[PDB]
């Protein structure tokens, strides 16, 4: 239901949009710069720099191709959690876990860790760790 959106915006109801009008679209959701960043995309994104845009192009903008941001994130966390396991498995225990934290004192991750299996066996996996972290 992009192109609702994107129309919806578009109150003027021409089937193009424009920087102003998509800087807005994006502001809707955050401000972290939505500014300058949007700036770059939409510059790259009109090739023609009529200043302007359409649906399509505004389809595209959306992002689809590359979709990624937190997943990147969580690619270090699972490259350490796989640091971790020096045994060759690719799961890791509570009480592992806990073992390789207490260096640092953290016990709460240990609580966290708990919390997390809710299953109730006492071990985890790096599957299970990622889509946690979804």
């Given at each position: 239901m992009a192109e609702a959106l994107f129309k919806e915006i578009?109150?003027?109801?021409?089937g193009a949009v424009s920087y102003e009008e998509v800087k807005a679209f994006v502001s809707k959701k955050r401000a972290i710069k939505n500014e300058q960043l949007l700036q770059l995309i939409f510059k790259s994104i009109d090739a023609d720099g009529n200043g302007e845009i359409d649906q399509n192009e505004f389809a595209k903008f959306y992002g689809s191709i590359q979709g990624q941001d937190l997943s990147d994130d969580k690619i270090g966390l699972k490259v350490l959690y796989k640091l971790m396991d020096?045994?060759?498995?690719?799961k890791l225990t509570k009480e592992e876990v806990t073992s390789f934290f207490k260096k640092h004192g953290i016990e709460k991750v240990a609580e966290q860790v708990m919390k997390a299996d809710?299953?109730?066996?006492?071990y985890i996996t790096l599957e299970e760790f990622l889509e946690f972290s979804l």
């Amino acid at each position: 239901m992009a192109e609702a959106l994107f129309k919806e915006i578009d109150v003027n109801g021409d089937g193009a949009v424009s920087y102003e009008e998509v800087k807005a679209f994006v502001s809707k959701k955050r401000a972290i710069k939505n500014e300058q960043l949007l700036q770059l995309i939409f510059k790259s994104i009109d090739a023609d720099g009529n200043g302007e845009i359409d649906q399509n192009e505004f389809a595209k903008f959306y992002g689809s191709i590359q979709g990624q941001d937190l997943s990147d994130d969580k690619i270090g966390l699972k490259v350490l959690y796989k640091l971790m396991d020096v045994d060759g498995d690719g799961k890791l225990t509570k009480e592992e876990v806990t073992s390789f934290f207490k260096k640092h004192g953290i016990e709460k991750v240990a609580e966290q860790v708990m919390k997390a299996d809710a299953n109730g066996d006492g071990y985890i996996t790096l599957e299970e760790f990622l889509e946690f972290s979804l």
